[PDB]
């Protein structure tokens, strides 16, 4: 209902949260920005409305080890990001999260996204897909997967260029409490 558990998911990339800022301004050069860790477990109170919150990031002590015993993603809402220029990659999540069912019933929301897409949509890198699959994956087609497997929303982000990825989190916030 309100309990939301969000973390940085995907196929093995940087903490997706380190980008929420890159879209804001610190990008990825050498500026000054808040630190990695992010452990919050509490409920907000607005107008008398309690909000269930729950999230956590690596580096429990700057060693990136306090958060190393994870070996298991346990957060209803997962922010995963993949690229639309891989060898039959999108076809692997159709048979991974849909046949497996998130929790086998709740079908928790899945914020689907595109990694470094800000170019991936051009007909030049698109060339690489041909060497393996001439059928590239597009946003207008992945939506059917979310509406077919009951996901939450297909979005896109570009850590540095800023693919307006604010919608990847903004739409996972209201879908987390569902």
């Amino acid at each position: 209902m309100q309990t939301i558990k969000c973390v940085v998911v995907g196929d093995g990339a940087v903490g997706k949260t380190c980008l929420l800022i890159s879209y804001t301004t610190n990008k990825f050069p050498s500026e000054y920005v808040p630190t990695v860790f992010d452990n919050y477990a509490v409920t907000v109170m607005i107008g008398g409305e309690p909000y269930t919150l729950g999230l956590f990031d690596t580096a429990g002590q700057e060693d990136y080890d306090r958060l190393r015993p994870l070996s298991y993603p346990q957060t209803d809402v997962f922010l995963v990001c993949f690229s639309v220029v891989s060898p039959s990659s999108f076809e692997n999540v159709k048979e991974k999260w849909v046949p497996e069912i998130t929790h086998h019933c709740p079908k928790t929301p899945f914020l689907l996204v595109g990694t470094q897409i800000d170019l991936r949509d051009d007909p030049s890198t698109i060339e690489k897909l041909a060497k393996n699959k001439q059928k590239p994956i597009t946003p207008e087609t992945a939506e059917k997967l979310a509406r077919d497997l009951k996901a939450v929303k297909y979005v896109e982000c570009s850590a540095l260029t800023q693919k307006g990825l604010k919608n990847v989190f903004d739409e996972a916030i209201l879908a987390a409490l569902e």
């Binding site: 209902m1 973390v7 940085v8 998911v9 995907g10 093995g12 990339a13 940087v14 903490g15 949260t17 380190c18 980008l19 929420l20 800022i21 890159s22 610190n26 990008k27 990825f28 050069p29 050498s30 500026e31 000054y32 920005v33 808040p34 630190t35 990695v36 860790f37 992010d38 452990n39 919050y40 477990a41 509490v42 409920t43 907000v44 109170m45 607005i46 107008g47 008398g48 409305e49 909000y51 269930t52 919150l53 999230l55 990031d57 690596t58 580096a59 429990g60 002590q61 700057e62 990136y64 958060l67 190393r68 994870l70 070996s71 298991y72 993603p73 850590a159 540095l160 209201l174 409490l177």
Partner: protein
């Protein structure tokens, strides 16, 4: 549970998040390290 805009008031809540990585990290993405969860079957040491 209700989803409203900025209600009239809002008493804070319990504890909050912390930050520990390295200056310019939360606002910096590089290389392509683990997603902070694949450890369930990654190249751990053990």
């Amino acid at each position: 549970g209700s989803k409203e805009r900025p209600e009239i008031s809002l008493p804070s809540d319990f504890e909050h998040t912390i930050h520990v990585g390295f200056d310019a990290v939360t606002g910096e993405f590089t290389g392509i390290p683990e997603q902070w969860a694949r450890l369930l079957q990654t190249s751990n040491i053990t």
